[PDB]
Amino acid sequence: MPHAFKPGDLVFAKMKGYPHWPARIDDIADGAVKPPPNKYPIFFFGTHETAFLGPKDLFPYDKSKDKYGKPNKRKGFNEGLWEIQNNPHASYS
Numbered sequence: 408m409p410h411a412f413k414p415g416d417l418v419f420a421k422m423k424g425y426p427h428w429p430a431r432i433d434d435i436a437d438g439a440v441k442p443p444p445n446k447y448p449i450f451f452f453g454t455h456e457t458a459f460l461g462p463k464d465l466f467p468y469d470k471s472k473d474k475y476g477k478p479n480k481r482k483g484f485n486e487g488l489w490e491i492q493n494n495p496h497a498s499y500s
């Protein structure tokens with residue numbers, strides 16, 4: 408059975424106006440800006456952006472990749488697909 412989301416979990420993350428996007432739940436570094444309540448720091452592969460999202464917009468990667476893990480025209484998307492498959496836990500700083 409599922410747990411709550413935790414740092415390191417791999418997802419597709421849904422934002423308004425964009426396709427479901429390869430992403431991971433990030434840690435919050437000591438000294439860094441915390442997310443609002445009930446939100447998670449989401450690191451988007453490919454664009455290397457962070458947004459704060461709640462679970463409604465977070466789809467576990469394994470379950471969802473057969474639907475969402477196909478190439479897309481959008482800037483950074485296919486790079487993102489490579490990262491989540493090949494080195495999802497790397498520093499992209």
Ligand SMILES: O=C(N[C@H]1CCCNC1)c1ccccc1
Nearest residue numbers: 422425428451454456457458483
């Ligand atoms: O909207 C943002 N991310 C989208 C763009 C496409 C890939 N990731 C989802 C975003 C977040 C924070 C800073 C700037 C932009």
